[PDB]
C-alpha cells in the first residue's frame, strides 16, 4: 500500500525487510513528510488490461474546497440579515423625517431640461458601445463568467489553482446570471452602457448643480464634463473589466453623501455607506468609493452630532454599521472565510506581490485639470459661483484615492477608468476656474493653454494601438501618428512652445489685458477633450470601414444580432 | 539565397489550394476549447472547458491570441508553476498548431488554433461523489503550490 496524505508520502511495503541499509524494525516505511511534494492527478493510466486483481484499487480524494453551497442555517441568516437591514434603513427613514420635508415633485426641476451635450454624450456613447474598443481583460472576465454557472463557485478560471476570486467577486455573479441568455459582445456589455448613461445623467443633473451656480450657468462647463466623461469612458471601460461600475458607484456614493449634506438627512448617507461597500465589493481597486466616504465623512459626522440631541446616539450609528456590514451577506454567499483566506494566500503566494496614443490619456484628464483647479481653489479663498464645500470634496476624492490606490495597491498603473465619473466633474470644475471671468490675469490663462498643448503633445507621442482585436485596421497602430510628413506630436509641441513664449512675453511686459488671449483661451479643456474624443472615434470609425468585409469590432457587434459569431465566422 | 551570412536560408514545400472552412463550421459549440485569457470576447459561441466539482472536461482545441502576446503575456499567465490550465493540458494532451487565415485580411496575425490530441485511450472518469461535509471554518490544509 502506497499513501500520499498531507503528512504522508510514506510509500511503505508492509511486511518486507530491506536488504541493504538499516532495518528500522524491518517495515520499509520510506518517504518524506511533506505536503509540498504531492502528485498532480490528471487521471490514472496503465498498460495492463482486463479484470482487476483483488487489492488493486486507487481511490484518490480530489480537492473540493470551494465547490460548496450554504446550508439552511446560513441561507436563513442571509435572508434575515438582508430583511433586517432594510427594516433598519426604513426605520431610519421614518425616524429621520422629523424636520418634515416630504418627497414632493419627483425628478427635480433641474432634470428633464435636456440640451445638446446630453444628446452628444448619449449618441456618441451608444456609437462607442457599438463600434468601440474592448478592454484588455474582457475575455478574462467573460470566460470565468461563462464557466462559473456550471461550476458554481466563481472560479478565477485561468491563473490560480481553480481558486475563487470570491474574496471580492459578486459582480461576476451578475455577469454569470446575465450569461444565461446569449453572450454576444453587443449584449453582455450592457452594464457598461447602462452605468455610462446613469453616470452621465447623475453628473450633468445632480453633481454639477450641486457643485455650484457658476458651473451650472456656464454651458462650457457642462460641455467639458460631457466630453471628458466620454473621453475617459471610451478607452478603458467599454469592455467587461468592471471599472465603469466602480466609477458609477463612486459617483453614486459621492452624490448620495452630497444629498445627505444638502438635505440634512441621514438615510442618503446610510445608502451611501452600503453603496460604497458594494463598490468596494466589486474590485480591490474599488477603494475610490471608500475614499469618497472618508472625504465626505466630516459633514456626515456633523449630521450625526446634529441628530444626537433629539434621538439616541445609538439608533443612528446602528443602521450605518448595519449597511456597512451587509456587504458580507452578499460577498460571502457561498464562500467560507477559511476558503477566502486560502484564496488570498494563494493569490499572494504566486501572483504579483506588489503606452498608446489613447491609453496615456490619464495624464490628460485628471493630471492637467485637477492640478490647475486645485491651485485656483487654493489661491482664491472664495470664488463666485463655485460651492467651496462639494468642490473640495470632489478634489479630495481624486487625491485621496491616489495615496492608497495608486502607490500602495497592486493593480497595474495607467488607470483612467475609475476617474471617468468623478474626474469628469473635476474637469467641469477646472474649466470654470480657468475661464476668463475667474482668472483675471491673461498670463496665467496663456500658460494654462500652453499646458493644454504640451499635454496633448505628450498624449499623441505614442502609437495608436488598441489592446487586441480593436486594433483591426487603425490609422497608426504600427507607427507614430504623422499627418503631413512630420508627426502631429511635433505640431502640438510647436504650438505649446508658441503659447509658452506668448505667456512669457506677457510675464515680462505685464500686460494681462490683450483680448487675443481672451478669444484664444475661452474654455480650452472642452476643446482638448473634443479633440481626443474625435480622434478616438475617428480611429475606430476608420477601423470599421477600412476592414468592412472581414472582422472589425463594429461589424462583429452589428452581425451579432444576426446570430453570428464575432471572430469565428471569418477565420478560415 | 543571395546571402553570404550563416543566419540566412529558406525552405520550400509545393503549393496547395486548401479546403478552408470557418471556425464556427469546423469547431461547433459542442467540443470544449481552452480559450486563452486574451481572447474570450472575440469568440462568443464555443463553450469553454467548463469544470464541475474539481474536475474539468478534456479540452479539444486551444484558440490563442497573436504570437507575441501568446509568448510574452498569455502562456506566462497560465502555466503549471503558478496554477494554470497549461499545467493539466500540457501534461496530458499533445498540442499541434494548425494553419488558420483571417479572411480577406491576409498578412494579419489574428492568433492561432492548436488541435490537442490525447496520448492513450483516455475514457472519461466515473467520479463517485459524496456530499455530506459541514465545516464551520475548517479548511483541511494548504493546497499544493510551488516550493
Amino acid at each position: 500500500e502506497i499513501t500520499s496524505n498531507l503528512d504522508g508520502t510514506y510509500a511503505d511495503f508492509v511486511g518486507l525487510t530491506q536488504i541493504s541499509g538499516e532495518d528500522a524494525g524491518k517495515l520499509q516505511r520510506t518517504g518524506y513528510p511533506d505536503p509540498n511534494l504531492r502528485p498532480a492527478i490528471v487521471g490514472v493510466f496503465t498498460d495492463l488490461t482486463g479484470p482487476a486483481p483483488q487489492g488493486l484499487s486507487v481511490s484518490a480524494e480530489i480537492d473540493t474546497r470551494f465547490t460548496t453551497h450554504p446550508t439552511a442555517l446560513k441561507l436563513a441568516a442571509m435572508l434575515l440579515a438582508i430583511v433586517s437591514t432594510v427594516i433598519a434603513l426604513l426605520a431610519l427613514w421614518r425616524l429621520d423625517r422629523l424636520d418634515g420635508r416630504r418627497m414632493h415633485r419627483l425628478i427635480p426641476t433641474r432634470w428633464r431640461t435636456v440640451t445638446a451635450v446630453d444628446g452628444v454624450v448619449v449618441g456618441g456613447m451608444a456609437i462607442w458601445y457599438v463600434i468601440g474598443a474592448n478592454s484588455s481583460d474582457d475575455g478574462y472576465i467573460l470566460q470565468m463568467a461563462r464557466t462559473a454557472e456550471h461550476a458554481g463557485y466563481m472560479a478565477n478560471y485561468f491563473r490560480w489553482f481553480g481558486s475563487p476570486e470570491d474574496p471580492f467577486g459578486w459582480y461576476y455573479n451578475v455577469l454569470a446570471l446575465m450569461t444565461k441568455v446569449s453572450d454576444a459582445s453587443i449584449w453582455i456589455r450592457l452594464p457598461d452602457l447602462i452605468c455610462a448613461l446613469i453616470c452621465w445623467l447623475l453628473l450633468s443633473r445632480e453633481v454639477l448643480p450641486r457643485l455650484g451656480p457658476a458651473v451650472a450657468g456656464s454651458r462650457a462647463a457642462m460641455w467639458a464634463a460631457g466630453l471628458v466623461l466620454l473621453g475617459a469612458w471610451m478607452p478603458f471601460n467599454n469592455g467587461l473589466r468592471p471599472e465603469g461600475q466602480i466609477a458609477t458607484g463612486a459617483l453614486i456614493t459621492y452624490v448620495l453623501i452630497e444629498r445627505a449634506v444638502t438635505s440634512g438627512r441621514l438615510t442618503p448617507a446610510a445608502l451611501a455607506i452600503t453603496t460604497a461597500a458594494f463598490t468596494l465589493g466589486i474590485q480591490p481597486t474599488g477603494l475610490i468609493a471608500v475614499a469618497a466616504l472618508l472625504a465626505g465623512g466630516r459633514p456626515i459626522l456633523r449630521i450625526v452630532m446634529r441628530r444626537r440631541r433629539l434621538v439616541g446616539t445609538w439608533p443612528l450609528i446602528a443602521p450605518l454599521l448595519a449597511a456597512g456590514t451587509v456587504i458580507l451577506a452578499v460577498v460571502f454567499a457561498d464562500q467560507t472565510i477559511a476558503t477566502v483566506l486560502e484564496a488570498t494566500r494563494i493569490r499572494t503566494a504566486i501572483g504579483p506581490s506588489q503606452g498608446a496614443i489613447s491609453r496615456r490619456v490619464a495624464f490628460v484628464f485628471t493630471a492637467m485639470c485637477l492640478f490647475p483647479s486645485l491651485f485656483m481653489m487654493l489661491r482664491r479663498k472664495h470664488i463666485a459661483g463655485v460651492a467651496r464645500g462639494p468642490a473640495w470634496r470632489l478634489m479630495g476624492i481624486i487625491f485621496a484615492t491616489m495615496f492608497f490606490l495608486m502607490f500602495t495597491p497592486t493593480k497595474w498603473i495607467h488607470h483612467f477608468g475609475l476617474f471617468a465619473a468623478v474626474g469628469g466633474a473635476m474637469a467641469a470644475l477646472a474649466t470654470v476656474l480657468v475661464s476668463p471671468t475667474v482668472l483675471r490675469s491673461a498670463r496665467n490663462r496663456m500658460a494654462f493653454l500652453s499646458l493644454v498643448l504640451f499635454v496633448l503633445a505628450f498624449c499623441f507621442a505614442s502609437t495608436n494601438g488598441w489592446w487586441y482585436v480593436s486594433n483591426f485596421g487603425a490609422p497608426f497602430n504600427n507607427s507614430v501618428p504623422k499627418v503631413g510628413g512630420v508627426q502631429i506630436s511635433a505640431i502640438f509641441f510647436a504650438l505649446s512652445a508658441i503659447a509658452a513664449l506668448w505667456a512669457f512675453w506677457l510675464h515680462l511686459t505685464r500686460r494681462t489685458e490683450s483680448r487675443v488671449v481672451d478669444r484664444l483661451t475661452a474654455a480650452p479643456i472642452p476643446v482638448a477633450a473634443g479633440f481626443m474624443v474625435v480622434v478616438m472615434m475617428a480611429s475606430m470609425a476608420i477601423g470599421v470601414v477600412r476592414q468592412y468585409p472581414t472582422y472589425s469590432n463594429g461589424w462583429a457587434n452589428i452581425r451579432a444580432f444576426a446570430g453570428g459569431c464575432g471572430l469565428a465566422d471569418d477565420v478560415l | 539565397d543571395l546571402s553570404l551570412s550563416q543566419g540566412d536560408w529558406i525552405a520550400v514545400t509545393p503549393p496547395r489550394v486548401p479546403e478552408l472552412q470557418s471556425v464556427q463550421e469546423y469547431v461547433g459549440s459542442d467540443q470544449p476549447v481552452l480559450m486563452d485569457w486574451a481572447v474570450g470576447l472575440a469568440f462568443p459561441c464555443q463553450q469553454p472547458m467548463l469544470h464541475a466539482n474539481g474536475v474539468t472536461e478534456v479540452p479539444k482545441f486551444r484558440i490563442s491570441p497573436d504570437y507575441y502576446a501568446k509568448l510574452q503575456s498569455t502562456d506566462t499567465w497560465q502555466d503549471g508553476i503558478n496554477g494554470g490550465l497549461l499545467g493539466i493540458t500540457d501534461l496530458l494532451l499533445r498540442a499541434s498548431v494548425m494553419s488558420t487565415y483571417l479572411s480577406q485580411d491576409w498578412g494579419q496575425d489574428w492568433g492561432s488554433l492548436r488541435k490537442f490530441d490525447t496520448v492513450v485511450e483516455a475514457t472519461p472518469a466515473e467520479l463517485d461523489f459524496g456530499s455530506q461535509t459541514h465545516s464551520g471554518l475548517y479548511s483541511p490544509g494548504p493546497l499544493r503550490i510551488r516550493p
Binding site: 453551497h69 450554504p70 441568516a77 442571509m78 437591514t85 425616524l95 448595519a322 458580507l328 460571502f332 | -
Partner: peptide, 28 residues
C-alpha cells in the same frame, strides 16, 4: 416617535451581528 427608534436599533444591531457572522457559518 418612540416606536421607530427601538425597531431601528434592534434591527440595526441584529443586521450587524448576523452579517458579521455570515462568513463563519456551516456549508454543505
Amino acid at each position: 416617535v418612540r416606536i421607530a427608534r427601538w425597531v431601528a436599533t434592534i434591527a440595526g444591531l441584529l443586521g450587524f451581528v448576523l452579517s458579521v457572522s455570515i462568513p463563519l457559518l456551516p456549508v454543505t
